[PDB]
Enzyme design. Structure first.
Site, PDB file in Angstrom:
ATOM      1  N   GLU A  78     -62.487  65.155 125.084  1.00  0.00           N
ATOM      2  CA  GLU A  78     -62.628  63.711 125.232  1.00  0.00           C
ATOM      3  C   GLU A  78     -64.051  63.335 125.656  1.00  0.00           C
ATOM      4  O   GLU A  78     -64.604  62.425 125.028  1.00  0.00           O
ATOM      5  CB  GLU A  78     -61.618  63.233 126.280  1.00  0.00           C
ATOM      6  CG  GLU A  78     -61.677  61.693 126.458  1.00  0.00           C
ATOM      7  CD  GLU A  78     -61.206  60.976 125.216  1.00  0.00           C
ATOM      8  OE1 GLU A  78     -59.970  60.871 125.015  1.00  0.00           O
ATOM      9  OE2 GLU A  78     -62.004  60.433 124.415  1.00  0.00           O
ATOM     10  N   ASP A  82     -66.660  61.139 123.445  1.00  0.00           N
ATOM     11  CA  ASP A  82     -67.168  59.847 123.905  1.00  0.00           C
ATOM     12  C   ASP A  82     -68.691  59.834 123.932  1.00  0.00           C
ATOM     13  O   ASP A  82     -69.346  58.904 123.476  1.00  0.00           O
ATOM     14  CB  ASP A  82     -66.669  59.602 125.341  1.00  0.00           C
ATOM     15  CG  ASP A  82     -65.161  59.578 125.436  1.00  0.00           C
ATOM     16  OD1 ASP A  82     -64.659  59.622 126.577  1.00  0.00           O
ATOM     17  OD2 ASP A  82     -64.480  59.539 124.361  1.00  0.00           O
ATOM     18  N   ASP A 168     -52.919  55.743 120.948  1.00  0.00           N
ATOM     19  CA  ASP A 168     -52.799  56.627 119.793  1.00  0.00           C
ATOM     20  C   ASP A 168     -51.355  56.747 119.320  1.00  0.00           C
ATOM     21  O   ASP A 168     -51.059  57.637 118.508  1.00  0.00           O
ATOM     22  CB  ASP A 168     -53.332  58.038 120.157  1.00  0.00           C
ATOM     23  CG  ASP A 168     -54.849  58.088 120.289  1.00  0.00           C
ATOM     24  OD1 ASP A 168     -55.353  59.178 120.667  1.00  0.00           O
ATOM     25  OD2 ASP A 168     -55.537  57.084 120.016  1.00  0.00           O
ATOM     26  N   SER A 285     -59.690  57.004 120.943  1.00  0.00           N
ATOM     27  CA  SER A 285     -60.730  57.615 121.783  1.00  0.00           C
ATOM     28  C   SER A 285     -62.082  57.722 121.084  1.00  0.00           C
ATOM     29  O   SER A 285     -63.082  57.858 121.784  1.00  0.00           O
ATOM     30  CB  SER A 285     -60.340  59.049 122.143  1.00  0.00           C
ATOM     31  OG  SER A 285     -59.262  59.032 123.086  1.00  0.00           O
ATOM     32  N   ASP A 326     -62.574  42.726 107.806  1.00  0.00           N
ATOM     33  CA  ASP A 326     -61.182  42.387 108.107  1.00  0.00           C
ATOM     34  C   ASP A 326     -60.260  43.447 107.546  1.00  0.00           C
ATOM     35  O   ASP A 326     -60.158  43.657 106.332  1.00  0.00           O
ATOM     36  CB  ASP A 326     -60.911  41.021 107.457  1.00  0.00           C
ATOM     37  CG  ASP A 326     -59.524  40.506 107.730  1.00  0.00           C
ATOM     38  OD1 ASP A 326     -58.878  41.047 108.679  1.00  0.00           O
ATOM     39  OD2 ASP A 326     -59.047  39.590 107.067  1.00  0.00           O
ATOM     40  N   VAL A 327     -59.540  44.189 108.334  1.00  0.00           N
ATOM     41  CA  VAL A 327     -58.575  45.181 107.850  1.00  0.00           C
ATOM     42  C   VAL A 327     -57.339  44.437 107.381  1.00  0.00           C
ATOM     43  O   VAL A 327     -56.831  43.574 108.141  1.00  0.00           O
ATOM     44  CB  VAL A 327     -58.221  46.157 108.971  1.00  0.00           C
ATOM     45  CG1 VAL A 327     -57.122  47.092 108.502  1.00  0.00           C
ATOM     46  CG2 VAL A 327     -59.487  46.913 109.424  1.00  0.00           C
ATOM     47  N   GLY A 342     -53.095  42.143 108.230  1.00  0.00           N
ATOM     48  CA  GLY A 342     -53.088  41.054 107.255  1.00  0.00           C
ATOM     49  C   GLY A 342     -54.405  40.294 107.379  1.00  0.00           C
ATOM     50  O   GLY A 342     -55.357  40.726 108.043  1.00  0.00           O
ATOM     51  N   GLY A 344     -57.297  38.077 108.684  1.00  0.00           N
ATOM     52  CA  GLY A 344     -57.693  37.657 110.011  1.00  0.00           C
ATOM     53  C   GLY A 344     -57.150  38.556 111.109  1.00  0.00           C
ATOM     54  O   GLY A 344     -56.897  39.741 110.899  1.00  0.00           O
ATOM     55  N   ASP A 346     -54.929  40.663 113.476  1.00  0.00           N
ATOM     56  CA  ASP A 346     -53.567  41.206 113.385  1.00  0.00           C
ATOM     57  C   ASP A 346     -53.343  42.201 114.521  1.00  0.00           C
ATOM     58  O   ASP A 346     -54.270  42.630 115.247  1.00  0.00           O
ATOM     59  CB  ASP A 346     -53.351  41.802 112.007  1.00  0.00           C
ATOM     60  CG  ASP A 346     -54.319  42.915 111.680  1.00  0.00           C
ATOM     61  OD1 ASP A 346     -54.500  43.907 112.377  1.00  0.00           O
ATOM     62  OD2 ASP A 346     -54.943  42.758 110.606  1.00  0.00           O
TER      63      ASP A 346
HETATM   64 CA   LIG Z   1     -56.846  41.729 109.617  1.00  0.00          CA
END
Ligand SMILES: [Ca+2]
Length: 368
Positions: A78, A82, A168, A285, A326-327, A342, A344, A346
């Site tokens: 970790e 990081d 996760d 992470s 935007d995913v 979706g 915008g 989410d």
């Molecule tokens: Ca989105």
């Protein structure tokens, strides 16, 4: 696009930050549990292998001077993820990297609480990474949530940015840390604090030339123990909605998370030196330290004068969609359950990832 591992030095090109300054003028913190001796040797391997100037580091015993700050072996993966992801995302330079080490011999969660407290009391790091967390209901039941939220509130008021991995386990944070649980959804602490930036996870596709192609939700399904690996996202059952989140209509009166997201899929993850060996690692992470290094560049571009940015992110991005990727595809559950990405904001990914040069230009014109 292709799914592959990435050297952390690639994250500036992927997130459009190459034209920004490095974080050479900004001090960055990392909260750890126990010591970082192997991590500092792995960090030297990282900067030397990439031909970079060395990073100035400090380690801070945040608890009792007689506490246990020995290295936790698993922990080093970790702190390696990081530190290397921050320095790579930062463009290869940070003013100083401070490791706020929690005492491992302290009762309950008090060692971790004291590590947060020391970072806020010292008020030297402008941006602090927290690639950690656990079921917010467990933190609430033993008083940890209340104690730590006071510390993060102080941090936000003094203009420090804590960045916290959203989790996760997808929506199944409180079910034995990620076992599928149908329609029962939960979130991680301290990501659910309104006084931190919560960072979720994507699957990152790049073009044959290394450029950004697209991102989907991070969800890599179940491991061989039957545990889900996917981005944390949902709303807190305890924290009220801070008013800047009112722009996401049709959501409950609770803190919604994550705020933003970056690369988290192991299959598209970071190549990290761990005990001297390069490994391809993901998780939220990873996503949080990418945000920390990129945000520290923007602090260095602005004389470290940018305050806690949550309200500004929500107003700027809701009005200016070009500031993000935007995913739109995927979910953070299993078996048909969970939230869907979706248009915008989410629940799996928040606003998505930041386009750093566009955000920098926005800050130049509008401030933050
Ligand atoms: Ca989105």
């Amino acid at each position: 696009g292709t799914a592959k591992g990435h050297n952390p030095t690639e994250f500036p090109t992927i997130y459009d930050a190459s034209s920004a300054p490095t974080a050479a003028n900004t001090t960055v913190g990392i909260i750890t549990i126990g010591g970082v001796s192997q991590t500092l040797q792995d960090l030297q391997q990282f900067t030397s292998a990439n031909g970079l100037a060395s990073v100035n580091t400090q380690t801070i015993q945040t608890g009792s001077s007689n506490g246990d700050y020995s290295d936790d072996q698993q922990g080093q993966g970790e702190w390696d993820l990081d530190s290397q992801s921050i320095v790579g995302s930062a463009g290869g330079a940070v003013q100083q990297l401070l490791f706020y080490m929690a005492d491992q011999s302290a009762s309950g969660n008090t060692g971790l609480t004291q590590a947060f407290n020391q970072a806020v009391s010292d008020n030297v790091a402008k941006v602090i990474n927290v690639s950690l967390g656990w079921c917010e209901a467990d933190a609430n039941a033993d008083g940890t949530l209340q104690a730590e939220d006071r510390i993060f509130a102080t941090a936000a008021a003094q203009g420090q940015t804590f960045s916290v991995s959203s989790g996760d386990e997808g929506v199944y944070e409180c079910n034995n840390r990620g076992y599928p649980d149908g329609s029962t959804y939960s979130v991680s602490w301290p990501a659910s604090s309104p006084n931190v930036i919560a960072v979720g996870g994507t699957t990152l596709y790049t073009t044959s030339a290394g450029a950004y192609s697209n991102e989907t939700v991070w969800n890599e399904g179940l491991d061989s123990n039957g545990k889900l690996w996917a981005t944390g996202g949902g709303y807190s059952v305890y924290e009220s909605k801070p008013s800047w989140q009112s722009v996401v209509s049709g959501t409950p009166g609770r803190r919604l998370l994550p705020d933003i997201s970056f690369d988290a899929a192991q299959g598209t993850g970071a190549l990290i030196y761990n005990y001297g060996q390069l490994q391809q690692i993901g998780g939220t992470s990873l996503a949080s330290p990418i945000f920390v290094g990129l945000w520290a560049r923007l602090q260095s571009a602005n004389s470290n004068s940018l305050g806690f940015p949550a309200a500004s992110f929500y107003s700027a991005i809701s009005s200016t969609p070009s500031l993000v990727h935007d995913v739109k595809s995927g979910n953070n559950g299993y078996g048909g359950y969970g939230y869907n990405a979706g248009t915008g904001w989410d629940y799996p990914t928040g606003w998505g990832s930041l386009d750093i040069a566009k955000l920098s230009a926005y800050i130049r014109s509008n401030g933050f």
